[PDB]
What does this fold into?
Amino acid sequence: LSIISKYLLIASYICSYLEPRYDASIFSRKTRIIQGRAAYGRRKKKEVNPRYLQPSLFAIERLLAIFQAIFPIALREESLMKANIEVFQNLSE
Amino acid sequence: ADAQRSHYTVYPSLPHIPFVKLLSGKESEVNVEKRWELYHQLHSHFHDQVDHIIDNIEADLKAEISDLLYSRCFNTIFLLGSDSTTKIELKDESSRYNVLIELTPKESPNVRMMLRRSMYKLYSAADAEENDVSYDLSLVENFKRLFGKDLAMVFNFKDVDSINFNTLDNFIILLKSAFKYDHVKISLIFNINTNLSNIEKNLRQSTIRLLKRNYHKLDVSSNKGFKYGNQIFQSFLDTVDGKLNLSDRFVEFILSKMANNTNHNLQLLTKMLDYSLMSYFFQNAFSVFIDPVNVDFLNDDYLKILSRCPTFMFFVEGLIKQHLEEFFVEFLVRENPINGHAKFVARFLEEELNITNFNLIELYHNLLIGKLDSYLDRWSACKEYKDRLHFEPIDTIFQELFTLDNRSGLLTQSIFPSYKSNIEDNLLSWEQVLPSLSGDLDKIMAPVLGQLFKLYREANMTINIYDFYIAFRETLPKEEILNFIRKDPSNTKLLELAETPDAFDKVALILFMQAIFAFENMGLIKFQSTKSYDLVEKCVWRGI
Amino acid sequence: ASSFLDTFEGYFDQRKIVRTNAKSRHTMSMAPDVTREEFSLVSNFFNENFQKRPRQKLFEIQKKMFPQYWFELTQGFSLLFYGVGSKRNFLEEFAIDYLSPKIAYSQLSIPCLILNGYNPSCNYRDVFKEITDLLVPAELTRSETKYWGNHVILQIQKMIDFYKNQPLDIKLILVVHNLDGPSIRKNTFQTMLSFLSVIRQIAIVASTDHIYAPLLWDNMKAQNYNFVFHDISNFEPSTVESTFQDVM
Amino acid sequence: SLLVKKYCKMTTEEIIRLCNDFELPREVAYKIVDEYNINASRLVCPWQLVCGLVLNCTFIVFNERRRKDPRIDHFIVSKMCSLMLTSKVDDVIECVKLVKELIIGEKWFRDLQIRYDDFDGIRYDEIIFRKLGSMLQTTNILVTDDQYNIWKKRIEM
It folds into this structure.
């Protein structure tokens, strides 16, 4: 597989085995201008071991958000990863 | 109305090349015709070698499949990284019929359909070479009694990763029952696109123990050892040798876009090279100067635009620090031997050092910048031959008038666009699309989709639709809208609706709702109900 | 309301939890009631009057792109047009008025089969029946029909192997308005057009509106399509495509 | 550094005198003041917001001489780090990239980009051919005609 397909699969496993509320604690690394509080993360460690169960269902935009959160990296360079046609081609593959 | 129909054929009326005139309309028609003919003679020269490479890789793949296939159990062959496009031809073994049976997951809804299609194919082939029977495995039992010869079945499973593995498993144990017949030989071919660990965990362990007795792996793809690719790239370089230059940014864009496609990277490489050649022969008026025949009509515009060159400016600055058309003609006879250097290095790697796993595109990249030594340090076998294999990249004046480059963003706009991001930047900005030149309304009032996308972007994940309508309504000037709606006096119902005191609350609402259903058609919004239309939630965020 | 707007920070930031004391339970009962006729009248007034001149200027700007489109079509690339706004008038004016008689003159008109993807009544069997009424291909033998196979796809696969060995002259102009429309986005229908797009003798001109439309095509389908992408944003009203989506 | 200290309170005189250091007209400085007054009570580091707003205004106001001379882009950002008490340059670049997305969709910024013809650095006649996929767009390979003329004047002088 390509690098885009492998990170899309990894992001798919993250989306299937994490809860959407805890995404703002793990991947958020941006400086804030408008005042706001980041998510605190999960309060207590649960013992379910979610990898033993069937995966949960997620949307496309959460997949692409986590994919560009975990993808490898002056005023025109655009550090983050855009969801162009080859990311969607790899997802269709 | 044919626009209210599904499909309609029309025949246009009629009362010739797509190349346009360059040099701001000053270029002659003979230069346009010459540029057309030169593009076609390079294009055909490249694609003939592409056709010979495609025929050779198909023929070699057929040869190695036959060699593995012919060298009380199955003969199993796992073609790894196979896109299920190979034509597997079988030899005519004497006194025995060899039958190919191909199976698609669409052709495999259950085991019964698999057997019925296989046995119909077997009976059709056997009758086509040499009363009807039941399309069933008893035909394999009585094959020698009905045809005299014995049988060799080769099963080719197209796209095994998409098949139901329970159905395939039960078909394998069903085919295992034909081992008790003395005249039957069965071979299986599995076209695997992921890897073998995915397919060994979906079959049962008895099936794996059955398939282990005679099996061969064969990893055949396009990325296997870079051979086929480098041949296409060398064919392109031999097409443009002596006339055109490849930029390092162009080669690194080829490497980056070919890294993101694994199964079909070859025709992607052909596509990018094709579009680069199309771009060069559509843009540059100096494309006719790649052969020495057409150097007899260089006009004042050619000399004007070849004087705006960084290499020429560096050269004349060096001459005025130390100390025109004939001098420009003088830079055409030179060789630029970097292509011959690259093919010599490739031959030295291939048949002296027995090194095949090298990427000639990345080698050409390191030759273009000049980091060949860091690329050759990895093999630990060119330690004493590095100085002879290294040559300095020569700098030639007016190279950038004969150059496939990537600086404008054209090749990443037509072939690999940021489609979703392009939609988002068109919707958010909107003055970069529409020209800034209803004469008063266009300077103060936004288009409804662009005005709606701002409040779309600055709201939250779930949006109440009436407050979103109110926030749309506060952004619109009611007096100028009512003045513009009274501009045409020839429509009576518009004038009788405008003087009604709630006219603006009708107008803004219906423009809002046509923009809302436009957003629903594009897929930006959705409704969190089926019977209600009171709350929307958004699915599209900018920048992702 | 949020610290981040774009990227994944904005996506995770705008997915907070909202308390029931700020529920914003307003409804469409508190709206000025409209029916079909006044909505249609004032809507068509704003479509035909509001920002008509700079849309026409942009349209005349993108008329100059047409020789590049024809050059892309003669080299085997299929055209896909995207952008905000409708693209029906663009494709009908480019394919019929410009591309068809100039392709007919360059090979000395070419028929244009036009598909309405906004219509849910579009069906691949009837469209392929019209295709076979135009191209008149060789009919499938008994051995080529296999065992309850899709006769449309098998006959296109016969046509591909036939048309490899023909002169590379464009016999048919195929226009697909709204390739991502509701009935037309299905996998069988996209397989049929990708297999038609392998044939060099058919020029493929298509448009799209959904922002997730590159998800429709895998590597095989994108290879068979062989697209050159063109951003044409014009803010057209989409008058005809809205007729299959009751806006009331 | 001024980019690190939080919860600062400012006067209008400081903003309008910092705007006149980079030679801005009055209405652009007034729009900078109003964009600060809208987000007054919902702000963490006001120095970053003011720095990035006066930056994103002075690339647009001074785009044509930046096309004339590139090192002015290295001159305005050098003047900023000499005033914001910041040693490195990348913090200012991350600051302007962070504040760019806050004013991109607004009417006054769109009107500024229309009036001074910035459109992220290029004219409308160039950007409408770059987004259309026109291959006849002006590539960044050859120098401009005005640059060639001023170079030939420099040679002849």
